[PDB]
Design a protein around this ligand. Structure first.
Ligand SMILES: CCCCCCCCCCCCCCCCCC(=O)OC[C@H](COP(=O)(O)OCCN)OC(=O)CCCCCCCCCCCCCCCCC
Ligand SMILES: CCCCCCCCCCCCO[C@@H]1O[C@H](CO)[C@@H](O[C@H]2O[C@H](CO)[C@@H](O)[C@H](O)[C@H]2O)[C@H](O)[C@H]1O
Ligand SMILES: CCCCCCCCCCCCO[C@@H]1O[C@H](CO)[C@@H](O[C@H]2O[C@H](CO)[C@@H](O)[C@H](O)[C@H]2O)[C@H](O)[C@H]1O
Ligand SMILES: Nc1nc2c(ncn2[C@@H]2O[C@H](COP(=O)(O)OP(=O)(O)OP(=O)(O)O)[C@@H](O)[C@H]2O)c(=O)[nH]1
Ligand SMILES: [Mg+2]
Lengths: 347, 70, 114, 320, 115, 48
């Protein structure tokens, strides 16, 4: 891939997301989704190996099916309303189809099976796009149709995502599958608060993106994709292990780290609506996420695993990866709890 | 007694395909280091054709056996 | 003389520096023939015809005139023949056909008519 | 402007700098076969960059002040110790072999970077493509376990795939009895303990595995001891080569841009030389690892990224 | 109706001709007569085996080009618009982007058949 | 010590240094005038 071609394709991925976000017409929203899927597959196939081919095919089949259900909902909405405006849907069957269509696009459980596999099959840079940028467009549509979403359906997906994400991460030794299951679990929190306060869905989304972007950027820096490969970081870049520790604890929602904020704010919103059993269940089940974050901090930062002799050759060479924005993202990933009231800007 | 640190036996707990072995995952190997699986040994088969003898371009008595790809 | 654009033979590229290329190949042939016994007719004959060709190359700086003197076609054909001769000389060392006849034929093997 | 996609977009493409003198030549042959002397002559006559064979301290010469570092910063791998006790218990034999391969891999990247960046050809003495000959001889002699051989194949399988083989392979073919004689004349005491079986395993590995493979994708030139004496004859053969096979014919700008992006980042090059496969020969524990690493950063001009060490005369650090 | 009548007559006549062709002639059917044809010698393998497509990349590009016509076919009607300034710009824009896509595939050797 | 290959950062990149200092100074001016003009609008609008 010619560098100019990569930029144009990369700009098209953003263009499709932006089209969804600025569109007031259901057709243009669907077009934006198609444009996004068209441009992301070549990024997935960038390295041209059988695994990347499998991931791209599994991704394409899933996203195509969601687009069909989404467009079906739009046409049903047109029959029962005669209009195309992006807003609440006027038919409950259309609401179900759109909600499920967006659930597949996000990778929410039980439409989650593709997220672990696609993420594992593609490079880290592509996985970063998949688990962060690709969340924006479906969430922005959910942010506009939520008044007509069936409450039981959306909360059922949120609960299942948190459980399935929590349990799925416990068995993983690959860093890309850990980030996939962690992503599934975090998506559950975003949609659980969606019916009550959409602002806290945006807050959780932004903070999830900052923390996920930081973790992928640190994995890219040392070119690590397994738990054991990451366990050598202490012997080359000690500073990196400390940043991984702080970021991982934040992702686990431990105060006083930034990652505690979205969980804190979502519990507040749910209790204000006399929803007590669900936030309690959610917070406890999120302890599964913390458990398999803590294993990574054990093998990465708090202990020292054995090295290999050839590691000494890497002591003589500096990191040359861009690590774009890493110093800023890690500070935002960890030291933002004192600034929590700034969430009103999202209002 | 100096501080304990993980040895090889401890580290290999985290080097398998999964953290918790089960009978359904006994056949799983860790993925390739560089994400590249070996190409298949399978040989793609070329179409074999009789070109003649009974053929306008075979002069009536040439049995040209061709192996074609497309 | 201006360099050719084509040798006229398909697949036989035009050589930019024929004189030097010929001197390299003729010298290599003479080097290889030094490992053949002095009494082998292959060495004496190949050395003789080689030294005559090399002497021409050193005395005629014009590719047209040199081609007329060598009588081997285009100068690129002469280079190809030099390469073929060098290939043969190496093979002859393994074969050693200067050795005495390996075997007489049966009595009437070459008698004709029967 | 450090090389990258932007420099490429602005017109820094490999095709603009290559010629018919932009070749990657490797000189091969058994021990004491005249490789290094021949290699220097080829480079001098063709105006190519000569790379002395990569040893235990090759990486040292490319970083810092260029001097060899103390051997604790190389795992204490010792060539002399290999010749004296090839079966030592501490795994010196394979630890040396694994370190040497990674040294050659690093050198090959440095050679390719020079070729692509400047267009000047290079000459190497052996390479990653022929390093396996010593691996094969070591194992056939029982100097390493079968587990070590499998490890080596794993590292080579994920590293040698990302590069292009040399344009020309020069092979000085010296018979084993001659090598055993030349080693005696040389005077190296440790090297004189090399057995004939070991040398016959290197020759067998070369003549049986290396050259047939290189034939299918490189211009392979072979020479005797006496032909190798005159580098002028060798240069003459190289200058009249065809180059009608191998992957170099299928390379274009975007492919060489990708290759250059790899070989200029040395950590990316060395990534898989340290795969977490815990062999006893190459594994090191935290207490030894941590202790040596802290020593490494105390070395002169080694605590900070090059250009940021005041204890070696670097200035303007508060503006860098 | 007329169109449906016309289509039915056309395919009714064709079917009648096939029926006549199959039931009028005297038939003598045996295995060698009906064996697959291949120049006098038995076929070597199945004709259902995969047949490689060398123009596969052109074939996919046809799908994308074959939808440009649907976007361009309304042009004669669009020429009747009051807003001709916007028309002509957008009509020329589509055709140019189609031309650019063709040039890209051409310059990148996408139209060359694989060997 | 003295490096066998010249470091990429042996010499300051004076162009980046000039721009980096210029951006920091420029933003600080913009922030002060911006802030100072927000106060006057706030004072004027509220009768202060
Ligand atoms: C104020 C409101 C916000 C409140 C939220 C909490 C704020 C803290 C958030 C921290 C954000 C991450 C930034 C942490 C900076 C860590 C710096 C440090 O620890 O030193 C790095 C040191 C490097 O070692 P060295 O080889 O000598 O130097 C190489 C680098 N030039 O590294 C090492 O050598 C250490 C290697 C051993 C690992 C030790 C691990 C245990 C100690 C970790 C301490 C940091 C814990 C951070 C976790 C969050 C704590 C709240
Ligand atoms: C890579 C992207 C490539 C994009 C390329 C787009 C090319 C478009 C070129 C401009 C095409 C139209 O160009 C424009 O046409 C209209 C006619 O319709 C002209 O307009 C003229 O005729 C119209 C009506 O026909 C009158 O109302 C108007 O008074 C008069 O100015 C403009 O004078 C001319 O500038
Ligand atoms: C607005 C509509 C009208 C505008 C024209 C739009 C189509 C433009 C088509 C592309 C033209 C340039 O792109 C094209 O690239 C190839 C590179 O493989 C060039 O070169 C190639 O073309 C010809 C034919 O294939 C070969 O004989 C030649 O060996 C090869 O080099 C062409 O000479 C050039 O024409
Ligand atoms: N085990 C091992 N020894 C190696 C390797 N490369 C070199 N050596 C040894 O390092 C020493 C120098 O290598 P050589 O270049 O082949 O020997 P030499 O004396 O220089 O002979 P020349 O070809 O003329 O240069 C020899 O003792 C080699 O056995 C290697 O990849 N593995
Ligand atoms: Mg040497």
């Amino acid at each position: 891939m010619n560098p100019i071609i990569f930029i144009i394709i990369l700009l098209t991925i953003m263009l499709g997301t932006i089209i969804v976000m600025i569109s007031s017409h259901w057709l243009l929203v669907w077009i934006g989704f198609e444009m996004n899927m068209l441009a992301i597959i070549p990024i997935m196939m960038k390295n041209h190996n059988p695994r990347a081919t499998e991931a791209s095919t599994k991704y394409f089949l899933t996203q195509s099916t969601a687009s069909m259900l989404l467009m079906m909902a739009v046409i049903i909405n047109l029959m029962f309303s005669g209009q195309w405006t992006v807003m609440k849907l006027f038919n409950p069957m259309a609401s179900m189809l759109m909600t499920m269509a967006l659930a597949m696009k996000l990778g929410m459980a039980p439409f989650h099976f593709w997220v672990p596999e696609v993420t594992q099959g593609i490079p880290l840079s592509s996985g970063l796009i998949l688990l962060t940028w690709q969340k924006l467009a479906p969430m922005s549509v959910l942010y506009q149709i939520f008044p007509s979403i069936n409450l039981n359906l959306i909360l059922t997906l949120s609960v299942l995502s948190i459980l399935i994400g929590g349990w799925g991460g416990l068995n993983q030794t690959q860093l890309r599958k850990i980030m996939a299951y962690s992503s599934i679990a975090h998506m559950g929190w975003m949609t659980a608060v969606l019916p009550y306060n959409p602002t806290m869905t945006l807050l959780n989304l932004i903070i999830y993106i900052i923390m996920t972007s930081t973790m992928f950027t640190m994995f890219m820096a040392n070119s690590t994709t397994t738990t054991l490969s990451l366990s050598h970081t202490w012997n080359k870049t000690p500073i990196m292990t400390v940043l991984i520790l702080a970021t991982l604890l934040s992702m686990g929602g431990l105060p006083p780290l930034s990652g505690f904020m979205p969980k804190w704010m979502i519990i507040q919103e749910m209790t204000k609506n006399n929803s007590i059993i669900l936030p309690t269940f959610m917070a406890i089940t999120a302890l599964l996420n913390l458990y398999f974050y803590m294993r990574l901090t054990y093998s990465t930062t708090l202990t020292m695993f054995p090295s290999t002799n050839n590691m000494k050759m890497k002591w003589q060479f500096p990191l040359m990866k861009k690590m774009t924005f890493l110093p800023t993202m890690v500070v935002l990933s960890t030291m933002m709890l004192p600034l929590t009231p700034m969430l009103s800007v999202l209002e | 007694a100096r501080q304990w640190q993980p040895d090889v036996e401890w580290a290999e707990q985290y080097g398998g395909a999964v953290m918790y072995p089960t009978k359904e995952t006994a056949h799983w190997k860790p993925p390739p280091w560089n994400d590249v699986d070996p190409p298949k040994d399978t040989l793609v088969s070329n179409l074999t054709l009789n070109f003649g003898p009974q053929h306008p371009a075979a002069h009536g008595v040439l049995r040209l056996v061709m192996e074609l790809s497309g | 003389g201006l360099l050719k654009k084509t040798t006229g033979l398909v697949g036989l590229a035009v050589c930019e520096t024929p004189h030097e290329r010929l001197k390299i190949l003729y010298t290599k042939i003479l080097d290889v023939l030094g490992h053949i016994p002095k009494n082998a007719a292959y060495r004496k004959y190949t050395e003789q015809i080689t030294n005559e060709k090399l002497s021409m190359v050193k005395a005629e700086p014009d590719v047209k005139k040199l081609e007329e003197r060598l009588q081997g076609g285009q100068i690129e054909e002469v280079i190809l023949q030099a390469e073929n001769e060098l290939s043969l000389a190496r093979k002859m060392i393994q074969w050693k056909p200067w050795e005495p006849l390996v075997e007489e034929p049966p009595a009437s093997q070459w008698k004709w008519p029967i | 402007l450090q090389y990258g996609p932007l420099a490429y977009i602005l017109g820094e493409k490999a095709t603009k700098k290559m010629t018919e003198k932009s070749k990657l030549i490797t000189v091969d042959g058994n021990i004491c076969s005249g490789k290094s002397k021949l290699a220097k002559e080829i480079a001098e006559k063709l105006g190519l960059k000569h790379f002395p064979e990569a040893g235990i301290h090759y990486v040292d010469s490319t970083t810092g002040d260029g001097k060899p570092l103390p051997v604790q910063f190389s795992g204490n791998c010792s060539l002399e110790k290999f010749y004296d006790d090839p079966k030592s218990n501490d795994g010196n034999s394979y630890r040396l072999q694994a370190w040497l391969y990674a040294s050659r891999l690093l050198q090959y990247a440095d050679a390719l970077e020079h070729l692509l960046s400047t267009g000047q050809g290079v000459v190497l003495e052996r390479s990653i493509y022929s390093d396996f000959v010593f691996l094969e001889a070591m194992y056939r002699q029982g100097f390493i376990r079968k587990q070590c051989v499998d490890h080596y194949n794993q590292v080579k399988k994920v590293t040698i795939c990302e590069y292009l083989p040399p344009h020309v392979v020069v092979y000085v073919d010296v018979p084993v009895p001659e090598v055993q004689s030349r080693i005696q004349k040389k005077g190296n005491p440790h090297e004189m303990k090399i057995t004939s079986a070991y040398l016959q395993d290197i020759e067998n590995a070369y003549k049986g595995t290396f050259l047939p493979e290189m034939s299918e994708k490189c211009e392979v030139l072979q020479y005797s001891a006496w032909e190798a004496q005159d580098a002028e004859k060798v240069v003459e053969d190289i200058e009249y080569l065809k180059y009608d096979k191998g992957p170099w014919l299928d390379q274009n700008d975007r492919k060489l841009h990708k290759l250059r992006m790899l070989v200029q980042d040395k950590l990316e090059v060395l990534n898989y030389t340290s795969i977490p496969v815990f062999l006893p020969e190459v594994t090191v524990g935290a207490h030894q690892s941590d202790q040596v690493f802290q020593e490494f950063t105390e070395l002169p001009g080694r605590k900070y990224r090059a250009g940021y060490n005041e204890d070696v005369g670097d200035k303007w650090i508060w503006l860098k | 109706m007329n169109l449906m009548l016309a289509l039915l007559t056309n395919f009714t006549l064709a079917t009648l001709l096939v029926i006549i062709a199959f039931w009028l002639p005297q038939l003598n059917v045996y295995s060698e007569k009906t064996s697959p044809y291949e120049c006098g010698f038995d076929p070597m393998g199945s004709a259902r085996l995969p047949f490689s497509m060398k123009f596969f990349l052109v074939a996919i590009t046809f799908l994308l080009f074959d939808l440009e016509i649907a976007l361009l076919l309304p042009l004669p009607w669009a020429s009747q618009t009051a807003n001709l300034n916007t028309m002509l710009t957008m009509a020329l824009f589509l055709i140019i982007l189609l031309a650019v896509s063709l040039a890209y595939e051409w310059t990148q050797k996408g139209l060359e058949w694989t060997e | 010590k003295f490096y066998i290959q010249e470091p990429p950062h042996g010499s300051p990149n004076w162009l980046k240094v000039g721009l980096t200092l210029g951006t920091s100074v420029f933003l600080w001016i913009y922030l002060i005038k911006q802030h100072n003009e927000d106060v006057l609008e706030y004072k004027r609008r509220n009768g202060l």
